[model samples]
Target: GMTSPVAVIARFMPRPDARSALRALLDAMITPTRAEDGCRSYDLYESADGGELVLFERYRSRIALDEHRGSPHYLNYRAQVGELLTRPVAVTVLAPLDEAS
Candidate 1:
């Protein structure tokens, strides 16, 4: 297990009303997400003084990350979340070079 896991660093800025909606969506996903077999860690964060949201996630492998994206919760988030965004979404799939020490 010395090889680094697959991971995500995602950011989003949403409209004011969208904040409540986004919170609900994120809350709904956390339990199911962390229960995933490959889930190493799945955390959601909000920035103070800004309507920015960040998701930090780690998975056992690319296949596991794919499993997450294919899940119903994730699919729903993908389908419904775009309308809430004010800023363009930012997503990064990190490599070993970027893994946390």
Candidate 2:
């Protein structure tokens, strides 16, 4: 059996007045998440129009991704992030497919 890496995309649209709070909460996750042994990449980006924030993350495997979801920082973010957002967070999980040579 082979284990392939996993990729995740999470989009967060902040409430107009709660952007700052949302940003701080998101920022708090960087340090702890990246420190995880299974983390490959954990980066955040803001939309060109500054309307949304996106998290682009990669983990060594499916188990690693699960571990991340259970981590303290992640759980803390999940518990409190909804109040700071205009809508529920959007999350997508990706598995490898065909790639160019």
Candidate 3:
């Protein structure tokens, strides 16, 4: 319970005119984010039929996740991704349930 990772599940729906742009931006984020010290895992997925994108990432802690939100690449992505999307990305933070607890 004391040593648990933080998981982030994010969903993105791109504007009709910006599918490629949104995909490219999301792809650009993976490498730098996965390289961070606090990152346990970082991955992106595209839904079948190629309409939506989802990011499932893990961090060492909430602080770790916050650190990522502050990173240069992330800041850059955050600054530009909004206009490419049909709506704001839906991001959910989660913690694993330890049955042993």
Off by over 4 Å in 3: 1-3, 98-101
Sort the predicted structures by lDDT, highest score first. Answer: 2, 3, 1
Tens-digit per-residue lDDT, 1-101, candidate 3: 32567889999999879999998999999899999999988988988977789999988878888899999999999999999988999999889675222
User: Against the correct fold, how does model 3 do in TM-score?
Assistant: 0.89
Worst 10 residues of 1 by lDDT: 1-10
Query: How many collisions between residues are there in candidate 3?
Result: 0
lDDT of 2 by residue, 1-101 (tens): 12578889999999989999999999999999999999998999999999999999988888899899999999999999999888999999988686222
Lowest summed-lDDT stretch of 10 residues in model 2?
Answer: 92-101
Estimated TM-score per prediction? 0.87, 0.92, 0.89
lDDT of 2: 0.91
Q: Which residue runs of candidate 2 sit more than 4 Å off their true CA positions?
A: 98-101
